[PDB]
Amino acid sequence: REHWATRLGLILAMAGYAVDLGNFLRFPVQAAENGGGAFMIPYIIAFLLVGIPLMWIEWAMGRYGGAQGHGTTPAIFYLLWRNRFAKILGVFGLWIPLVVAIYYVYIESWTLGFAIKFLVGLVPEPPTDPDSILRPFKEFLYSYIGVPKGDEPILKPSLFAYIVFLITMFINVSILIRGISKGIERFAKIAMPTLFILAVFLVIRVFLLETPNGTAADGLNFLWTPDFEKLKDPGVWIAAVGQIFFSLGLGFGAIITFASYVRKDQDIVLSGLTAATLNEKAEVILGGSISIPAAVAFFGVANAVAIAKAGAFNLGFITLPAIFSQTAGGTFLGFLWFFLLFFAGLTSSIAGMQPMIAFLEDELKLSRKHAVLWTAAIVFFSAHLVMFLNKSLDEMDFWAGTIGVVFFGLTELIIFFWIFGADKAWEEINRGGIIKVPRIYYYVMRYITPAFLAVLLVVWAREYIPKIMEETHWTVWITRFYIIGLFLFLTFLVFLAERRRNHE
Ligand SMILES: CCCCCCCCO[C@@H]1O[C@H](CO)[C@@H](O)[C@H](O)[C@H]1O
Ligand SMILES: CCCCCCCCO[C@@H]1O[C@H](CO)[C@@H](O)[C@H](O)[C@H]1O
Ligand SMILES: CN[C@H]1CC[C@@H](c2ccc(Cl)c(Cl)c2)c2ccccc21
Ligand code: NA
Ligand code: NA
Structure with a gap:
């Protein structure tokens, strides 16, 4: 079996998976909407009671499986719990990264596309008023993605967007096909310092932003001033748990x-x-220190609430590109911003497609080359649904990348700490540990952690599912039909794997 060559490479690869666009866009928006500096209270608590324990558990499950030659959940769940229902539950944890990759790599390709366009100077050049500056970049983005102009739920991506997606897939493959140590690990040792250098440079350039509407210091102020009254709202506590859960990529x-x-x-x-x-x-x-202070420096603290409510996508793909074009060398600054987002996404997507590759290698005995190429073929083909059908991305992101992950995270806890055995799980976690997990976390992992995920799951289910099932366009069923099909497809591959094993 392949292994990480160095401890540093392992850590940077894992950190690279966790660090993505969300770090620079989702977190600042969430904090600004949920108490500002006060948001750090439930955020740290959720990190200690949910993020950390579950992370150790996922690491433990993986290492446990890998020692027996299995890197994915269909086999791993079965090893933990030798039951047919376990193999089926395990399929979910292979279905999720497969479905997520189908839309994630496309989103990642947008950042490469925008980086190129900013670098060469092919960006709108306004003109005054905020709507006169934002609109050309909104249209710029809409034309790239092919946001519907009529009533039809059809996307028409530019030729450039499509080619860049091809290039983006090729880049993922070039890394993955070289394997864990010579591919993923080697890239992580370059991409992470680069990501850090780009970020620090952006922080510095942002802090120097001075407009008639305000400064970056106002942004840090608006973002980091505590609003303890929001700590009464359970939603803020729910948002913190969710923020921690997703940012860690659990x-x-x-x-x-x-x-x-x-x-x-x-x-x-x-x-x-x-x-x-x-x-x-x-x-x-x-x-x-980057996105929110920049937005507040340019549009003033008066529009700070409106900006955060506009969302992470609008902030990163419309608002920030717009602001840069109004500054000296902002064309190059926009390039660095998207270059940053691209590497942040690339480090995550190579991690996200590895599960499918691992399944083909471990369970179907495919060579690395064949496993990578077939995984790439499936993702590339399937992404055409995301590229051409409006809201297909949102539907995939909800079922797999939102509801699915929280459900599966809870399933992981139960199968590992309740079914497999709490004592065994604990020993599986601590074995070989340079430090030992504090004894107190045994109770956290067994009772507290699954309780937080259960509350998160139920609240989000009751809040979002009825809307999703009753207020959406009929075309969402195309996406539902397809990804249910993908689940049936993986179930069949698991069937073929076990029938091959019985033969050998
Ligand atoms: C959900 C997956 C849909 C697959 C993508 C559909 C391919 C789109 O093919 C369409 O062919 C039309 C021919 O008249 C052209 O005019 C359009 O430009 C082209 O996008
Ligand atoms: C989700 C899948 C949607 C794919 C978008 C398909 C692109 C539209 O393809 C359509 O083909 C028709 C051929 O009879 C033409 O007459 C239409 O005007 C054209 O829009
Ligand atoms: C988990 N938070 C980020 C990190 C990884 C990144 C991600 C996760 C799984 C996969 Cl399969 C891929 Cl390709 C990419 C991602 C996707 C959707 C939503 C959020 C996130
Ligand atoms: Na993150
Ligand atoms: Na990443």
Whole structure:
């Protein structure tokens, strides 16, 4: 079995998976909407009671599986719980990263496309008033993606967007096809320092932003002034749990698969805690210092509430590109911003497609070359639904990348800490640990952690599912039909794997 060559490479790869566009866009928006500086209270608590324990558990499950030659959840769940229902539950944890990759790589390709367009100077050049500056960039983005102009739910991406997606897939493949150590690990050792350098440069350039509407210091102020009254709203506590859960990338299956290449007695406690900490640092220090302060510096603290409510996507793909074009060398600054977003996405997507590759290698005995190429073919083909059908991305992101991950995260907890055995799980976590998990976390993992995920799951289900099922366009059923088909497809591959094993 492949293994990580160095501890540093392992940590940077895991951190690279966790650190993405969300660090620079989703977190600042969430904090600004949920109490500002006060949001750090439930955020730290959720990090300690949910993020950290679940992360150690996913690492533990992966390393446990890898020692027996299995990197994905269909086999791993069965090893933990030898039951037919376990193999079926395990399919979910292979279905999720497969479905997520189908839309994620496309989103990632947008950042490469925009980086190129900013670099060469092919961007709108306004003109005054905020709507006169934002609109040309809204149209710029809409034309690239092919946002519907009529009543039809059809997307028409530009030729450039489509070619860049091809290039983006090729880049993912070029890394993945070289494997864990010479591919993913080697890239992580370059991309992470680069990501750090770009971020620091952006923080510095943002802090120097001075407009008649305000400064960056006003942005840091608006973002980091505590509003303790919001701590009464349960939604703020729910948002913090969700923020921690998603930013760490728990429940997606990538962590488990990456951990499956950690040697049997190699540390995961300190390594996992370090990777998690790197994500948080990149999130609150780097992410919190770029996007929001820039938006507030340019549009004033008066529009600060409106900006955060506009969302992470609008902030990163419309508002920020617009602001840069109004500054000296902002064309190059926009390039750096999207270059940053591209590497942040690329480090995550190579981690996100590895589970499918691992399944083909471990369970169907495909060579790395064949496993990578077939995984790429499936993702590339399937992405055409995301590229051409309006809201297909949103539907995939909800079922797999939102509801699915929280459900699967809870399933992981139960199967590992309740079914497999709490004592065994604990020993599987701490074995080879450079530091030991504090004894108190045994109770947290067994009772507190699954309680938080259960509350998150139920609240989001009751809040979002009825709307999703009753207020959406009929075309969402195309996406539902297809991804249900993908689940049936993986179930069939698992069937073929076990029938091959019985033969050999
Ligand atoms: C959900 C997956 C849909 C697959 C993408 C559909 C391919 C789109 O093919 C369409 O062919 C038309 C021919 O008249 C052309 O005019 C359009 O430009 C082209 O996009
Ligand atoms: C989700 C899948 C949607 C794919 C978009 C398909 C592109 C539209 O293809 C359609 O082909 C028709 C051929 O009879 C033409 O007459 C239409 O005007 C053209 O829009
Ligand atoms: C998990 N938070 C980020 C990190 C990884 C990144 C991600 C997760 C799984 C996969 Cl399969 C891929 Cl390709 C990419 C991602 C996707 C959707 C939503 C959020 C996120
Ligand atoms: Na993150
Ligand atoms: Na990443």
